[PDB]
Symmetry: D2
Subunit: 326 residues, 4 copies
């Protein structure tokens, strides 16, 4: 049976409340040892080894925990057959994409969380962790990049997002669909992401102790420019726009970001809209303003790529190329 490392980071999968029934809970309060011991059947599929990297709600996920995870996976690659990462739901789609672009270990890297605390009735965490180990132990899971395994489904780290605030079925690859489905401990894979990931990206974080500063500003009717101005005034390396419709910007926000672009801030148009590409050749002249179109990457995922892009280049054309390949 293969050797599988759980790296624990916290999340509701490690959460607890005073009632099995009430919705109230506090996050990252349970050790990895406890999560493992709640899944007795893990022994039938893997030799499991828990390490506790941090114990936080993923609402508090940050650059430093991203660098710690990537370096640790890359360092320990030769020491194990696979990784599972216990992690909160809230920013899982961000961590998952960061590790998909930075880890050079082509052995299965599987992220897993839970929508209901360990303490709740019909808790989802136990079977999720069982299914994440299944996936990490599966030879066919190798060379697919970093994965998220929730509700019996294997999702690629690039497309995967959380679609509902409470539903155990929340995680979906809303543009290009899942990679495979798990039934009775077995996976039928029918898809692998074409976009370049892991050992095919030039992004190497092994030496990095910080990441370029990238902010996200929201567009809506009568949008204030003040949030954009604050990011520019703090000398942010990049700004991602959560645009309306096909990545459009309220006029005030537009003007601030056009200005910033001219002083060498990187500016990526994304969209607040939950599915579909922010395209070139729409209502915005990107090449004129020195803006980048995010494609299918939602604002939080575009931040992930823009940060790593800013470690290679500050040129809008080369950042546009990066957004077309990764």
């Amino acid at each position: 049976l293969p050797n599988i490392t759980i790296l624990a980071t916290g999340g509701t999968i490690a959460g607890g409340g005073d009632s099995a029934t009430k919705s109230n809970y506090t996050v990252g309060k349970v050790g990895v040892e406890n999560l493992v011991n709640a899944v007795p059947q893990l022994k039938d599929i893997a030799n499991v080894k828990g390490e506790q990297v941090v114990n936080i709600g993923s609402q508090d996920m940050n650059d430093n925990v991203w660098l710690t995870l990537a370096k640790k996976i890359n360092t320990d690659c030769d020491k194990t057959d696979g990784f599972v990462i216990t992690h909160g739901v809230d920013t899982m789609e961000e961590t998952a994409y960061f590790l998909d672009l930075t880890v050079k270990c082509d052995k299965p890297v599987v992220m897993v969380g839970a929508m209901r605390p360990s303490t709740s009735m019909s808790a989802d965490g136990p079977f999720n962790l069982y299914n994440a180990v299944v996936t990490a132990a599966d030879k066919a899971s190798a060379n697919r990049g970093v994965l998220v395994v929730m509700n019996d489904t294997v999702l690629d780290g690039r497309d995967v997002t959380t679609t509902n605030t409470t539903d155990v079925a929340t995680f979906k690859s809303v543009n290009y669909g899942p990679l495979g489905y798990i039934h009775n401990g077995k996976i039928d894979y029918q898809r692998t992401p074409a976009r370049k990931h892991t050992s095919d990206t030039p992004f190497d974080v092994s030496k990095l102790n910080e990441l370029p500063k990238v902010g996200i500003v929201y567009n809506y009717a009568n949008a204030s420019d003040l949030p954009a101005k604050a990011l520019v005034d703090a000398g942010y390396d990049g700004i991602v726009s959560a645009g309306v419709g096909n990545g459009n910007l309220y006029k005030s926000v537009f003007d601030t970001l056009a200005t910033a672009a001219k002083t060498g801030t990187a500016v990526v148009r994304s969209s607040r809209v939950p599915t579909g590409a922010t395209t070139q050749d729409a209502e915005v002249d990107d090449a004129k303003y020195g803006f980048v179109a995010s494609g299918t990457l939602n604002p939080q995922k575009a931040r992930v790529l823009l940060q790593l892009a800013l470690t290679q280049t500050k040129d809008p054309q080369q950042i546009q190329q990066i957004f077309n390949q990764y």
Copy 2:
């Protein structure tokens, strides 16, 4: 034949004038006597408080002069205007908003049959007392739950939490649902003598989120801040600290979510009562902003604002 007023505001369905739009669909004469008046001609990315105020007042004033309203509008903020009119219009005659994903000049342009189906809906008396509607892709959607789900799909508009009110086939609607939340003339919001709305801003949550956006709104003395939280409306610690402060310093704070479906609930990870925060329910950030603006024309009390978020 019903009298139906088209108020035009712009969007991709049109620079093209109100009268061209109508003339492009001679079949409208089959179903209504339509008058078109131009209110603005802008991209809905540039929609604003002033246009909202113009629209509410024009529909309220002109209610008794027509049998129905169609509002031609951009797709990008259609869901914001629709909810704003939903809460401020006192006309319970049908008010139908319509747009298009493709221009008039494009292959298989959606604008024509959309406008036709939006006049069918405005001409149907069964459409009365359902609040403000969005009609797109042969579907009748309530102004509260309706949102754009895709950047380019003609089928983008969906009521993603509670579903459509009705489907249009052969110029007829089978209506099987109506919004339970209080709308139009069952709301206390009265905008007839208002010339501006409270200043409400939206800040985004993500990993390593800056508190600078939230600080810049507090520094401006914004009336309100909506959080597009992560998951069930949760806040990155820096943003949590800045909004905790905001809430006890005369800024109403609403927790919404960047997650496209489901409620931001009470009784999860956040003690709303302890911070004086309001949980948005199924209102996404831009919709929460609409209702927070209007709640602040009545009150600044976090408890009274939360009751508003529970009723409308």
Copy 3:
């Protein structure tokens, strides 16, 4: 505390007896006084007219003896029973159906919290006069639009055309919708002295479809045949010819669709009036069968059957 009767019928949520199921969720005592009675213990793949009849009569008879009903049932035909009870139950006290995708013995078993949420729903007086409900995956679904969308997903149950009535969080439901179609005590269907229903069969359409299934139903003298058509309820020519004949020989014919969402409409490719066929609207084949069976306890007239399909 509400009195709530659980009628158990089997399914994966259970061979396990009614009283084990309850005892497995001691938290039920927090929200209701629950009595469990066993009605059958079968897989819902083996659900049948007799069980339907037992259930309608038991709920109608016992309505005045309890505050609410929960029916534990298999997932596979849950959507058929739910609609049948929706049209035949005269009790407008809450009637809630519940199942599970995973057994009691499985990791992260869904059965417990499902039963808990199904008792919350049956105990909520706001659940009254909404017709027969299905509560699965923290969602309250109307018995007419609800269907299983996935072979193994715990989130399988959806009201795919008109959306849910409400979401359950922390034992509380925000109800924002109610089915407009006539249900329970607003229907003329009365099954109290019926011991069998008319024989209705379902035939499938596809490329090169055999007419033999449809002929075997006609040869049996079936009371009715539902077509699971292709697209907008269209029929392979051989099947069209056999059902054209059926319809003028004392077999009611309903055009439904194998397509999982949308209405089978009139006024498309098929002259329903010329063939004496009925268009099912949003009723999928197995639901159309429910309503065709009950329509045939009142009438055989294709026009009167179509009016039924337009009202219920």
Copy 4:
């Protein structure tokens, strides 16, 4: 500009009614020449050549039109750069899967239809046909198997199905998602079907003048066995069950199909449920009864594979293997 053959088969894309407004229309009433001439902009992307194979509603699609299409594509492969197939919506998902298993031409084969007649306001047919030509002319569309292009999206023939009776957005790959999205005449491909198709299947129809007889029976509460009995009595080579939930059968239907199986009828459990696999190792002992599990293949698609399987073998274990690879 590449040489693209339209093969026309009819469907609503070639349909007409007496009103642009009314929903009433008759199918397959317009010639290919007319469809081409309604899309003036086709000249900018392709040298188009129309041939009219048949003019029928796809509700009347049949084995003989399937054999005619496959042999014609395979015969003409060397004569063109790509194929588009104008076809009705109703059974497109069936034809698309049949051609995906039988055509040996690895040049783009693209199917296209329309939900609104040519005569209707905002007809979808014109832009669909433009987008199907774009896809057929795209070099990257080669070696992806047979495609369906509707509503700006490229779908693989295996997973693609129609999900709504009237909606122009109806066609979706409901299990594994689309292959790419078309914006402004350009496609970003992120997926290719893993299941074997075209020149990697052993199915060769070049000599065939008929197909094995396969029927579909529907399960529901109180299901009659009479439809199953009629198929068995007519000596059908196979029967597909549209099962309830995870491919379950009403007891009467079960008994008839178990019996048939024992006399060498092939029996495949599918599901009436619109998404998810009909799995092995559930409520049915398949190996005991000599039944086959359809996996993600809906009943009409399982008929397609079962017919072609029955041209190689009558053995339930080998048919199960075929359902695991194609």
